[PDB]
Amino acid sequence: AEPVSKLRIRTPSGEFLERRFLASNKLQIVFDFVASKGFPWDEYKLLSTFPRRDVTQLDPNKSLLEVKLFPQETLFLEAK
Amino acid sequence: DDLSTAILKQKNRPNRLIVDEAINEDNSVVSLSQPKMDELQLFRGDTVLLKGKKRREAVCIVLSDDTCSDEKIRMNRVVRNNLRVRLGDVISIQPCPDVKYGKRIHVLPIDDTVEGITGNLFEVYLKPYFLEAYRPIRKGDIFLVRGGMRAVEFKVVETDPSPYCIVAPDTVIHCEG
Ligand SMILES: [Cl-]
User: CA-CA distance, B105 to B164, in Å (whole number)?
Assistant: First the structure.
């Protein structure tokens, strides 16, 4: 198997989005995914909690592998 | 059910783990090996329910740790204390998808003297502790917050939904008292 990142993303109401991405995907592919579900970049941040960091504040051209989102992470959408 | 119960004829229990020292000093975190998480079908950042002695329970977030032995669980002093366990004791761990973003929680400092001696408890302790952290908490928890220049212990009086929830950005935090 070629490295995959499974991401589970809590929506503001507390339920989940889920999607598996190739770990070599550009972080942009994750932004696009949440946007397509109704959570555009200019309205919502995407947070991780261990460590606490703002994923939307990272270089969208870097890969998931590069930015340390692999092989599993739970993220959180939060209104800006 | 209980750590203290078993039938004579039973398929083994992969979810009974030996308490070990934390490397991550965070109150909300427990760490397992990746193979143990695979075996238990646990996902990084999942909320879990831990059972300890004297029917104590705790909710934590589970992370993988590459130095953790398969049979062990790393947890900090606060969680150990809430579970009434010591290093080398046995706890049980199970998935807890039942946990919702809370509507409100009620907490209070267990020390009656601290508020008078320190800075604003919400601004100096609680807000920094919970903000953007999505911590699970359970009614009855005593948790230790390191803010300002001295730690303050808080007790969870009640949660809504009960008896556990995740403290979200719109969770109303009542501290009184
Ligand atoms: Cl309350």
Answer: 9
Helix (H) or strand (E) holding B130: helix B127-130
Chain B residue numbers with beta carbons less than 8 Å from the beta carbon of A10 are: 134
Task: State the method.
Answer: X-ray
Give distance in angstroms: CA of B107 to centre of ligand 1: 8
How far apart, in whole angstroms, are the C-alpha atoms of residue B37 and residue B53? 23
Does residue B79 belong to the interface with chain A, where contact is any CB pair within 8 Å?
no
Sorted by sequence, the CB contacts under 8 Å of residue B73 that are 6+ apart come out as: B17, B18, B19, B20, B30, B31, B32, B91, B93
CB distance B134–A13 less than 8 Å?
no
Domains and CATH numbers, chain A: 1-80 (3.10.20.90)
- The Cα of A74 is separated from the nearest Cα of chain B by a number of Å equal to 5
CATH of B99-177, one of 2.60.120.1600, 3.10.330.10, 1.10.10.10, 3.30.450.40: 3.10.330.10
What is the Cα–Cα distance from B156 to B22, expressed in whole angstroms?
Answer: 23
**Annotated domain spans of chain B:** 1-98, 99-177
Largest pairwise CA distance in chain A:
37
A36 shares contact with chain B (CB less than 8 Å) = no
In angstroms, what is the resolution? Answer: 2.0
State the CATH class of domain B1-98.
mainly beta
DSSP string spanning B43-96?
Answer: -TT-EEEEE-GGG-EEEEEEEE-TTS-TTEEEE-HHHHHHHT--TT-EEEEEE-
Distance B176 CA to ligand 1 centre (A): 9
Q: Residue B100 is nearest to which of A6, A14, A72, comparing CB atoms?
A: A14
